[model samples]
Target: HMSYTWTGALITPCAAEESKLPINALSNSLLRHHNMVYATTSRSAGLRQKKVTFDRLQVLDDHYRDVLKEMKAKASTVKAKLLSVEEACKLTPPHSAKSKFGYGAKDVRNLSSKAVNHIHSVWKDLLEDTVTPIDTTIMAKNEVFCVQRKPARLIVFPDLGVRVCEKMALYDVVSTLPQVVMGSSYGFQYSPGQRVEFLVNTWKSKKNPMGFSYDTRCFDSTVTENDIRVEESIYQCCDLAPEARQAIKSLTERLYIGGPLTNSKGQNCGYRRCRASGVLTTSCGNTLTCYLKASAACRAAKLQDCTMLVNGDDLVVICESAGTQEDAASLRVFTEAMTRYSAPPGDPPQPEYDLELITSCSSNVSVAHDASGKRVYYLTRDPTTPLARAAWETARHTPVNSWLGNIIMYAPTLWARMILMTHFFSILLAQEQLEKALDCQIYGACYSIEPLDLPQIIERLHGLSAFSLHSYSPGEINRVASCLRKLGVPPLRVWRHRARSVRARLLSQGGRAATCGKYLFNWAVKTKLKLTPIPAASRLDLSGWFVAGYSGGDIYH
Candidate 1:
């Protein structure tokens, strides 16, 4: 971004003590610590066996029946075809669980008939047995638990071949139909561009707007046995082939009803009596029930100008507010209805008169300064996940680089640009691959990306505001500072410093890598290297990443 160039014949790694760590940003240090992920103690027995039931007194009226009918019809129009074995194999990642029949994910990727036929056998069983339940592999994911640390979460997902079958059957339907039926209310459909536009337009439209996020406690666990069947009812509405219908129904009872739970040591951790954490139905089922409850309650409560956005269990409502006490009572009524619908609040709903304080999708709009003290309002989150994966990217190779996903998804965020970008590019530089692109998935699908394409990618995803932005509410700043402390990460001062040093190194490398640094890190240098638009044709189809458009949700296995 600036005129200064290193004249040294050979550039070497910085000798700074802090640079010794693979993740140099003090912001990156704590999040990348190895102990952040570990095996935890056993889970609760009473909670694990908690019986989930539905109100027998409740009846399904035309309103409930017909909405499900429409959603089914919407999905039926798009037939889910069988994926070729090879294409299906590619969907399996290298890190996927190995087959009991003697092969790993690499064997599957290479189209070994053992893996292929086993996947075929699983698909065949899905068709023939139809209602037979599936057993899922369960493991815990060690992650930060507030200021408190926890060993691992009980993670539940399916075996490889079954997952492949899931995509062929329902992935496309689930991704596209929700957005199609629910329209703009579908939160997963909104990207940074759409999100920023919505926030701005909503703010300008209202003299006084009330925004609040509805937090659902153990959202997946709250799914009653009735909820899974209700979700299946929507699926059955489609005129699917007999096999497909049976497969969907079978998966619902088997996988959707929850599965066997196991610990890291392969101990009998017991069965999941509630919603399993990882399943094809997780997102779609949560979205449908949430919308059904929220929409019905909004009307019943008579909330004015109510615009609700829902992604799975995460929700944000922008509506009119009455007297403080009246609104509090109104929210209680809202909670009552949600509880009746089997989706209870985690933290009881509280209204935010200010928009900046509302958090959704693990990100919030916050303000910060660039090197020149220019204010930038960007969506950012705690660096935990990206840092965790950055550490993995540091140690050995991984099938999916979650850091790249963060860099793309939160391209406009300061930490993503300054810390994550520098951290990844430095490693890639040392690994000796700048132009060589690699594949990673965002939103559970594959994408080809390189460190250099980020300039154009950022420009394409968010507008020119990626370079500079304006002010935001002061409350959010303090929250960001508090979070940095809570995570034991560095202050903002350190990230900006490393970003500049990283930018300098990139520019000296020449070609597109130089171009990426020049455009994305323009603030660090004075020359203001211009950003050119990402070529429409060359850009990776990341639409699958966010299910953005109603682009018919391309089928993947």
Candidate 2:
């Protein structure tokens, strides 16, 4: 029976009429077995993706605004400080607070600390935002095959092609600029003449089938084997070698002039001569041919023209008669022969001129005055005839094709590029060398990991139960001793007769063995006071511990 209750209820009705209805629906008829079941289910999907995007955007925008505001504030602070310092400097007796010698160390330290704290606070605020996750899987097709964490010292050499060599050298110089600037700024010191030697060695090491022998003269004679070895060691340690230390000077000169092979005694050397002539011979084995060719080109560029300018002191013999014409014709033939032999092949073709005719035609030349009252000359092919009187202008404007012009026109861009790149590359190389040193230390420490055998020692100790003392087998004893030695422990005596039974029982249990050993070791150490006592004066000065009573506790803390 179910009980029914209501908070407030009082009803009485008996006058309503009842209608007849179907009675089968209300009947609990035929007994039947049936089961009724009920269940409820629920699921929740997280809003992770949307939340992440919103958070990232909020963080990025906040950081961007903060950084901009901080930068502006920093600029204003710096400007104000600089102006104040300047004003302080301009005082008649100098402002004592800002004066270099007047200000105490503490004042300077406080000021510096304050400035640093300000900067740090700004940076902290700017970077206190969350970063968005980025996918970094995609890679470029021409990606560098070996991307080393440590920078490398790169030495580039010209391949077989002449144009390629020139381009490589130019690019190498260009690449060196950053290195040079960094080295200078950091006060990186380098050995003298190292630059030249490095270039020479690089040239020599090139692997070219059609290369010439390396010219040693391009390098200094003082470069020695010992120097090279030392420099190599420096490179290994610090990524920088004494510049030009590896250059081969003698070999450079031979290759520079296109000279035939010469022996050590300056005799016709079979090795060099055969190689120079393009002859296949055993003498040319292991020779650096391409380097030699490059050296030769370098030398040619350095050569100076010995031709001197004509002076006023020299004698001038001029012919003016018909007989003079005959002499001029002979002179012209001689001058032509000289020009043909002296000029290099492919140089501008020498202009043909009759030297005798030009000389004879000037024989009757006489000095006179010009319209501007300057000196003039009047002359005719015939010695007695005067053609005209004109000032000898002595054309001051030199021709553009002169030797000086050619030298000036030679491009210096390649040399500049090489210098800059080399300096930068050397610094990068130096960093690599330092990293290698650190690697060695890490490798050595990792190599020393090994398990020491201590279980066997415990077993032997358990064997001795009399006199309450434990005994260790010789092997076990030695193993323990070796471990102590490796750990840098000093020797100590042990009393074994006392409590042998207890020690044996402790050793018999494998789990208890290690615990027992540690207990014994610690006990011995405590009794002997193995560790040296630290000096009382060496302890930290904590007198400020009492300051909490006077200063607010938070301030002291």
Candidate 3:
């Protein structure tokens, strides 16, 4: 069966959409190549449609079943509870897409009586009706980028009422199950620092380490009905309430396996038989399915001592090398096995001896030296996308600022410090909105973080070394320099001078703003303050910052 079956109706947008990057007075100051930046709109949805719509072929073997059994055993140890109506309501993001049933995210979050009543009714229906296909809204994501124009990503989500019901039924399950089942292989469970450590340690553990990231071509589409049913069976292994169990099963049959796709205008656009990107189960399901298929493929390919790092469909495998020729052939076999299992590679897998060369989650491990001259490992990526998105955000106000998230995740990297921090802080200072909270996604979950709190947040997530790290690798520096040239961003020298002024302004403010200056921008100054651990870092509760992937799940924290 095809992943999707269309009804000959157009996927219409609810409002006007922009395909070109909007320019503002501050745009050229950050990036001169305004034409290089563009945003994906519904016009490109046809391309995305062509890419994602396809037939799948999956051949499950004994190895696959064995991995499935192991996962089930670990899942059996978990006990998930259903959330109360009020609890589920509180989990809704304030500006989430509204329901067709007259209530919106704000109403849900406020625990309005109507919202609670509808949620209860939805839950009741879930338990009683096990086979009614749910309705989902399909929309093309308006994501910004540059040069390489990607098709607009499609998001399929249920009504606001069903989303809350999903939370009520499976929030605890999604949060707890992945870590328990996949253990350290579950990538989103690690912070940026911890992820680098895991990669380094995993690399060192192998005698002759061979690694590669598997780029599953349209991973969500490759997921079949059997895969979703397998995922449900694993969930069933968990000790759950009877109502929760029935609801999960109902949701599986009605929503997870397949659903009706409705356009923004409430017209039936198509039917989706694969994974829905916007459901609560999306992150957890993708993680489980990817891990299972990769584990099975590793066995079939005879890869030695494989250790996987998975964040949703983003995967990196490090294993004992079988020599260069054999390793190359092994990856080919791995690709074949994965293709047989329906999750074919977009870019075929390649063997990487150096850990830093293997990119996963759009980042790779790179080395730098701290002020104390100790070798430090940090995560870095090509600055093109982040810089491009930052340019767009600087020109126009976006609901979620990608620049802040990149800065938080890549704080220790040279590009992040020199380019991102310098540009954004300068803008924020000029607007006198340095204290304002802005939204950004970390591992797919939305977080409203204040600009002033960055000092403490960076310290907690990365450490004081984020502020004091210097002498980045030549490879890393070259990547940043090349990206700057490509995007027409100011060279490092110009950013450094601008950063010094931003640093001085932040220092003059005194308080959290001063703390940001003394820490984040120390590199821009000739004489740096002796960097120390933040006092407030230990008190921060960053538990859910990295627990799972929720990219299109409409999640917030």
Candidate 4:
């Protein structure tokens, strides 16, 4: 029941005599011009192949006609301009001045205007440039048209609308096929505000913009939210070295003590030496300085020994001489019993006796305090054990020298550890005190001076330490100048000047220019005591200032 459309065509062979004449050729006797040509259905076979050939020839003939017309018109215009300039130049003298300067002939210059107008008219003869027209409708429909003189007779079918025409219809078939759709060929669908909202949601879910969590804490909360303003404000007002203040407090405390003790000769009391040249002054009188030194050495040695005693595993008792082997053996038994109840459990148990013999070199036997006289005595057993109880009983009857006894007492190891811990704690406490002191108004002078103000400004803040001043290299001067330009300060100018005036003033006032230079250099570049401002002035103006002040009028081009 479905009906389909088909287009067809038919052709017949031409007679042999008719085929002898060129197809679509002009008549031979008198040139016949036919803009449109037609072919009979009987000669359709010969005309069908010549369809494109005749159409191209017609286009060429049309273009040739148009070109011939254009050339003729251009020749006349060029000739007219040439004739005008030649007549104008002949009337003018060659030696005449054209204008204020001797550029060209004076009268003929007016002729130059005429020459320009003439040349413009000659340009107008050219054809207007344009694109060649194409038949897009014919291309889209895929149709081929040709004229014929007589109708062709061939088999025809009504249902097959045009069989030959269908074969030539290239456009209809291609238009029905499915086409590829590319995303790049199409525009984006999202609106600008919608795109922004999408980006914001992505940032919140994926980026975690605040950078906060239940497990991790931010050291600086303001930094987490991109709040650099808070950070900058805090930094601007914050004290950079609060620790230095605490150090100063401790130093001040030490400085106040007796203004540092000194001897009669104004030398450090802590450092004293005997001036006696040789051994002859050994019996001479000892000064208080010498005694204090000796006493300090003795106390230091006693403290060392006391530390050893408290930490020592055993006590060692030395005997000058044992009269017999039995005496040494008896002393061992007594020392053992004394260690049980008399001595504490953790304390050194019993004094271990080491016996020695003294040889009598002189008729009178004297004990040797120096190393030469002592010798070891052989014993069968350790003797100090038995001597401990007897020595303790004898010690009850003998009077004890309180000072000497106090020196023998051993301090516990726990007490020594506590003392060491306290010493470190005191250092931290002193540091904190110094930091608090520097924060007060008393230290305001240190931070008041501007770091960039150079010579005079530095002189006012002379109390600052050398380390506290700013330091700069040669290259930094240009950088500083640029920074100052941003902060609206005029650039600094450096020049070499004779030191005579500065030297005279300083010498008269008991000050040194060398010292002042050192101070100035430190104050300008070294310390954070002063804040540096960004330069807001133009660098070009800075060059001019430098030349005027420092270049001696020989500014480089």
Tens-place lDDT per residue, model 4, 1-557, is 00111112223222221211122221211112122222233444223222211110001123223332332232223211112333323323233212221224433335455433443332221112112110000000011112223232221110011111111111111111101110111111111222223323332343212110011011011011111211122122223233222322221122101121121222332210111111111111111111212222223222111111000011121122233444334334323322221111222222222111211100001111111223211111111111121122112221111111111110011111111112211232333321221100010000111111222222221212211312223333443344333322222321111122222332343323333333322222322134232132122121111010100000011
Compare candidates 1 and 2 on TM-score and give the better one. Answer: 1
| Residue 103 accuracy (lDDT) in model 1 | 75
Model 3 per-residue lDDT tens digits across residues 458-557: 9998988899898999998898889888888888999999989999999998988888888989998887779878888888888888877777777778
Model 4 Cα shift for residue 426 (angstroms): 43
Please give the range of 10 consecutive residues that has the lowest summed lDDT in model 4.
Answer: 134-143
Q: Please give the TM-score that candidate 3 achieves against the real structure.
A: 0.99
Please give the range of 10 consecutive residues that has the lowest summed lDDT in model 1: 11-20
Off by over 4 Å in 3: none
TM-score of each: 0.80, 0.12, 0.99, 0.12
Instruction: Residues 1-557, candidate 2: write the lDDT tens digits.
Output: 00111112111111231121112221111101101111111100012111111100001123223433432332222110111221211211111112212332233234444433433332232233212111101001110111111111111111111111111111222122212222221100211112223222332343320111111211211122222222222212222122211211211222211232222122331111111111111011111121112222222322111111000111112112223444344334323322221211112212212221222102212222322344322221220111000000011111111111111111011111111112212222333321221100010010110011111221221111100112323333454345323322222231222223323444354443433332322222223222222232134342322111110000101
lDDT of each: 0.62, 0.20, 0.91, 0.20
lDDT of 4 at 428: 22
Show how many residue pairs clash in every candidate, following the order shown: 0, 43, 0, 48
Which segments of candidate 2 are over 4 A away from where they belong? 1-324, 339-372, 376-557
lDDT of 4: 0.20
Off by over 4 Å in 4: 1-475, 487-491, 494-504, 511-514, 517-557
After TM-score superposition, the amount by which residue 310's alpha carbon in candidate 1 deviates from its true location, in angstroms, is 1.3
Q: Which prediction has the highest TM-score against the true structure? A: 3
